[PDB]
Amino acid sequence: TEEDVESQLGLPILGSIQKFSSLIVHEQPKSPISEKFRGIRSNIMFAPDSAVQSIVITSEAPGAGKSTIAANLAVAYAQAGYKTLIVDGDMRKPTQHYIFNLPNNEGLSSLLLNWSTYQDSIISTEIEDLDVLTSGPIPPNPSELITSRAFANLYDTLLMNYNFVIIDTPPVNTVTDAQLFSKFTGNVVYVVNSENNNKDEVKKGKELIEATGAKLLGVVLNRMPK
Numbered sequence: 419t420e421e422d423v424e425s426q427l428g429l430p431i432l433g434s435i436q437k438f439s440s441l442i443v444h445e446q447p448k449s450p451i452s453e454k455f456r457g458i459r460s461n462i463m464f465a466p467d468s469a470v471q472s473i474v475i476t477s478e479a480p481g482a483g484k485s486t487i488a489a490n491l492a493v494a495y496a497q498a499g500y501k502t503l504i505v506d507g508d509m510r511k512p513t514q515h516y517i518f519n520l521p522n523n524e525g526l527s528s529l530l531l532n533w534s535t536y537q538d539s540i541i542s543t544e545i546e547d548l549d550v551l552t553s554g555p556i557p558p559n560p561s562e563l564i565t566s567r568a569f570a571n572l573y574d575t576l577l578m579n580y581n582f583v584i585i586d587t588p589p590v591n592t593v594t595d596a597q598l599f600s601k602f603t604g605n606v607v608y609v610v611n612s613e614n615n616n617k618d619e620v621k622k623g624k625e626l627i628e629a630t631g632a633k634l635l636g637v638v639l640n641r642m643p644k
Contacts, residue, residue, distance in 0.1 A: 419434075419612070419639075419642070420434055420639065423610070423612075423637065423639060424637075426617075427610075427620060427621065427624060427637065428624070429608065429624065429634060429636055429637045430461075430635075430636035430637070431636060431637050431638075431639060432457075432458045432461045432462065432607065432635065432636040432637060432638050433454045433455070433457050433458040433461065433638055433639070434454065434612075434638075434639040434642045435451060435454055435455070435483075435487065435638060435639065435640050435641070435642060436450075436451055436454075436641075436642050436643070436644055437641050437642070437643070437644075438451055440486050440489060440490075440517045441489060441490060441493055441517070441545075442455075442490060443455050443490045443493040443494050443497070444493050444545055447497070452490075452494075455490050455491055455493075455494040456494050456498070458491055458494070458607075458638060459491065459494045459495055459498060461635075461636065462607070462635055465635070468633075470605050470635070471577060471581070471582060471583065472576075472577070472582065472583035472584070472585065472602070472603040472604075472605065473583075473584055473585070473603055473605045473606065473607050473635065474507075474585050474587050474596055474599045474600050474603050474605065474606045474607070474632070475487065475488040475491070475584060475585065475586050475587065475606075475607050475609060476587045476588070476589060476590045476596035476606060476607075476608060476609065476623075476627070477589045477590070477608070477609040477610065477611065477623070478589060478590065478591060478608070478609075478610055478611065478614060478619050478620050478622075478623035479589050479591050479611065479614060479616070479619050479623075480589055481611065482589065482609050482610065482611035482614070482640055482641075483609070483611065483640045483641060484586065484589065484609040484640075485508070485513045485514060485517060485586050486517065487609050487638055487640060488504060488514075488584055488586040489504060489514065489517045489518070489586075491584060491607075492504040492548060492584050493545060493548060495581075495582045495584070496545055496546060496547040496548040497547075499547070500547065500580075500581040500582040501547050501549075501579075501580050501581045501582070502547055502548050502549070502580060502581065502582045502583070502584070503540070503548075503549045503550070503551060503576060503579075503580045503582075503583045503584070504548070504549075504550050504551070504583075504584045504585075504586065505526060505551045505576075505583065505584065505585045505586065506525065506526065506550075506551065506552050506553040506586050507526065507553075507564070507585040507586055507587045507595065507599050508553060508586055508587055508588045508595070509526060509527055509553045509554070509556060509557055509560040509563065509595075510556065510560060510588055510593070510595075511588065512525075512552065512553035512556070513586075514550055514552055514553070514586060515550075515552040515553070518541075518543055518550050518552075520541055520543075520550060520552055521552075522552045522553060522554065522555075523554075523555070524538055524539045524552075524554060525539055525551055525552035525553050525554030525555075526539070526551055526552070526553050526554045526563075527553060527554035527555050527556070527557045527560075527563060528554040528555060529551070529554065529572065530563050530566060530568045530569055530572065531557075531563075531568075533554075534554070536575070539551060539554070549580075560595060561593070561594065561595060561598060564595060564598040564599060565598055569602075570602070573602045583603075585599050585603060587599055589623075590623045590626045590627060591619060591622070591623060591626075596627075597626065597627070597629075597630045600627075600630045600632040601630075601632075603632065604632050604633060605632060605633050605635055606627050606630070606632050606633070606634050606635065607635050607636065607637075607638060608623060608624065608627060608634060608636070608637050608638070609637075609638045609640055610623075610637050610638070610639055610640065611640055611641055612639050612640060612641050612642050613641050
């Protein structure tokens with residue numbers, strides 16, 4: 419199935435994740451699934467002259483499990499020794515505060531608008547070397563925030579303070595938020611729901627990501643069978 423997707427979509431497979439509290443890499447660190455997350459990490463970082471310090475994670479459509487992939491990949495980076503930040507850049511339908519069991523009264527949107535401080539907006543989790551910047555309150559104008567000087571300045575600060583930054587984003591099919599964040603990271607990981615029978619959507623997502631000019635590092639195939 420992996421080889422089918424690699425050829426039909428024309429992208430390398432960074433890893434395939436079987437169907438499977440969300441944080442399997444933390445709760446079951448020796449599991450074969452957790453090892454596949456470590457394989458994704460390794461495939462991103464060892465692919466010579468790439469210096470990847472940050473990535474956008476997006477998907478072809480809603481319901482692909484993208485946010486769970488992003489969170490577990492962040493745990494894998496932290497376990498490998500990277501001081502890691504996961505940013506919930508989906509300010510429309512945020513989920514990282516649910517995944518990590520955190521409040522969402524302060525986060526990305528409030529930080530950018532000066533309603534909360536840097537120090538208050540980023541939370542250190544109970545997992546060593548893993549911090550989370552939740553989305554904050556839902557703004558009426560998310561794309562304006564992403565393209566603001568405020569975000570450009572924040573991004574520079576994050577690169578000073580973290581060895582690796584992962585930005586979860588909305589799916590790429592209807593809004594351009596993922597593309598706008600890709601200006602900053604220069605790098606995108608594409609989560610594809612293997613259960614999605616609409617291959618036009620899968621192919622279109624690749625096209626949309628490539629149109630940014632960012633490096634499409636490869637695909638994470640999710641919800642694979644045993």
